[PDB]
Amino acid sequence: HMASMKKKGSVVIVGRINLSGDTAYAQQTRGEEGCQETSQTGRDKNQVEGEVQIVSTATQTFLATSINGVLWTVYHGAGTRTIASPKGPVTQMYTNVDKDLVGWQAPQGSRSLTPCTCGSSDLYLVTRHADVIPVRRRGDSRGSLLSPRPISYLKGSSGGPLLCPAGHAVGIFRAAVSTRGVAKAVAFIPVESLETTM
Ligand SMILES: COc1ccc2nc(O[C@@H]3C[C@H]4C(=O)N[C@]5(C(=O)NS(=O)(=O)C6(C)CC6)C[C@H]5/C=C\CCCCC[C@H](NC(=O)O[C@@H]5C[C@@H]6C[C@@H]6C5)C(=O)N4C3)c(C(F)(F)F)nc2c1
Ligand SMILES: [Zn+2]
DSSP, X not given: OGGGOOOOOOBEEEEEEXXXXXXXXXXXXXXXXHHHHHHHHOBOOSOOOBSEEEEEOSSOEEEEEEETTEEEEEHHHHTTOOBOBTTSOBXXXXXXXXXXEEEEEOOTTBOOBOBOOSOOOEEEEEOTTOOXXXXXXXXXXEEEEEEEEEGGGTTTOTTOEEEOTTSOEEXXXXXXXXXXXXXXXXEEEEHHHHHHHO
16 A cells, blocks of 8 residues: 555666776675665765676666766666665666666766777677677677677676777677577667667
């Protein structure tokens, strides 16, 4: 009934993928208990850094990527949820279920990737474990892994970027094409589709 109706928590940044040096690695910035509390209050005082964030709800963990001052992720991870911030919950500025896409203003202190205009098909997928996986572009929204691997290795990386050789953002990882549990290809939201939404 109305008195007891609950509110879903915010998405919470719990880590990041460090791409600042010669070695990519995941960093945790908040543990599960603090995540639970921050999801309820929507108030996250932690300092944010970098381009790729690891984010969590009470029930799911995935990635989010800053491109042109917007933190983008997948709707199948975030739904319509706010994101926690130093001054409380922040409402989405983009929501498009048809593209499996949502976005919030990028957090104070993040760095944004630049949308790719190279027109190159040699891509790199960045996972939540900081693996950098070469992917050949195979269409507007598909790419093949040069080295297939079990889908287990990609789980939790939706919202992560596909990058060009120069480090520009080409798209946002959405879904994996699985054959007998092996990911041979991935689907992604092209950056042009984000730029249109913008
Ligand atoms: C009401 O609005 C909605 C509601 C629900 C929706 N659920 C959608 O798909 C779901 C979620 C997504 C997923 O698993 N994402 C990844 C990830 O890591 N998620 S996650 O972070 O763990 C997370 C779940 C915590 C967030 C990158 C994957 C990593 C591993 C794969 C694991 C096996 C799953 C294989 C599947 N394969 C597939 O569907 O292939 C088809 C599409 C295309 C490639 C071909 C056929 C696939 O990838 N997924 C199924 C989509 C879609 F748009 F994503 F499809 N839209 C929605 C819009
Ligand atoms: Zn580029």
